Structures are given as C-alpha cells and as structure tokens.
Amino acid sequence: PWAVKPEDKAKYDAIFDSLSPVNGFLSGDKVKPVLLNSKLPVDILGRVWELSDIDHDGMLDRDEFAVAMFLVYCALEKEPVPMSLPPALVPPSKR
Amino acid sequence: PSVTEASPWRATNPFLNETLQDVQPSPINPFSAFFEEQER
Ligand SMILES: [Ca+2]
C-alpha cells in the first residue's frame, strides 16, 4: 500500500512537471526549493531526501519524489517523521 | 580536529550544504495555506 496514493502521486507529478524534470527525475537543486516549499529546515528536508531517494542515484524519480513530498506534508500535517525507511512508502517500482 | 567539514549526509543530499549556499526557497510552495494556519 504505497504511501503516495495515486491521487497524491499525480499531484506530485504536477509539481514535478512544473519544475521541468530530467527524464522523470528531479534533482536537489530543483527539489530542495520545492522542499523549502515548507517551513521545514534543511536537516529534516535533507533526511527526507536521503530516505526518499530510494535508488540513491542523486535524483528523485517520480516515485522517489512522491515519497519525499508525502513526507514533507507529513511534517506540516503535524505528524512525526521517521528516520527509517517505511516499506509502505518504498516505491514498488524501486523494489 | 579535521572536522570543519562534517556534512552528516550521504553525498547524494543537496541539503548537507547548509548555511553556505542553501537559501534558495522557491515560490512553488504547496504549503502556502499551511503557513497561514500553522497552529492546529
Ligand atoms: Ca533516485
């Protein structure tokens, strides 16, 4: 039950596309300021990045980013964020 | 004492460069309304 429900995924694909991505991947120079879309600090944003980029290719794939931004709302939505990888949100594409 | 550079991330991270070249917030925020409420 991948955390990024297709509704949120598609929504994330919307912000994704709005950044003019690279082959369906976005990188930190673009992603980070979409991370800074929140009032969150780079420590959590970075931790989220390091978790959200499953393949650790240095880019956030449509799924990997959907993961990231899901975790970003998680913090804003007053929900404590994990430092370990919750397999409910490990992209089935990247498994 | 070799620890002036101690970025605690795994190199793949673009935030481990904190307080040097990080201040680049984009007006792409989906959290625009969040900042208006905050307390809840
Ligand atoms: Ca990746």
**Whole-number Å distance between alpha carbons of A21 and A24:** 6
CB atoms under 10 Å from CB of B12, counted, come to: 18
* Contact yes or no for B30 and A69 at CB 8 A: yes
Q: Is the dihedral of CA A46, B27, A25, A63 positive or negative?
A: positive
Q: Are A10 and A46 a contacting pair, CB within 8 Å?
A: no
Q: Ligand 1 centroid to B10 CA: how many Å?
A: 13
Residues in CB range of A62: below 8 A, 6 or more apart: A9, A12, A13, A16, A21, A24, A25
Of B13, B29, B30, the CB nearest to A46: B13
Q: How was this structure determined?
A: NMR
Q: Which residues contact A79 (CB under 8 A, 6 or more apart)?
A: none
Helix A62-76 and helix A6-18: axis angle, to 10°?
100
Question: Which tokens is B35 given?
Answer: 């900042």
Q: Please provide residue A25's backbone torsions phi and psi, each rounded to the nearest 5 degrees.
A: -125, 145
CATH of the domain at A26: 1.10.238.10
Q: Are B10 and A56 a contacting pair at CB < 8 A?
A: yes
Domain ranges of chain B: 1-40
Report the alpha-carbon distance of residue A94 to residue B6 in Å, rounded: 30
Range(s) of the domain holding residue A48: 1-95
- For A6, counting Cβ atoms within 10 Å of its Cβ (0-12 exposed, 13-18 middle, 19+ buried), the class is exposed
Which residues neighbour B15 within 8 Å (Cβ) at sequence distance 6 or greater? A28, A32, A35, A42, A43, A45, A46, A49, B9, B22
The three-class DSSP label of residue B31 is coil
- How many A from CA of B22 to the centre of ligand 1? 21
How far apart are the C-alpha atoms of B1 and B11, rounded to whole Å? 21
Q: Max Cα separation, chain B?
A: 45
Q: Enter the tokens of residue A88.
A: 């409910």
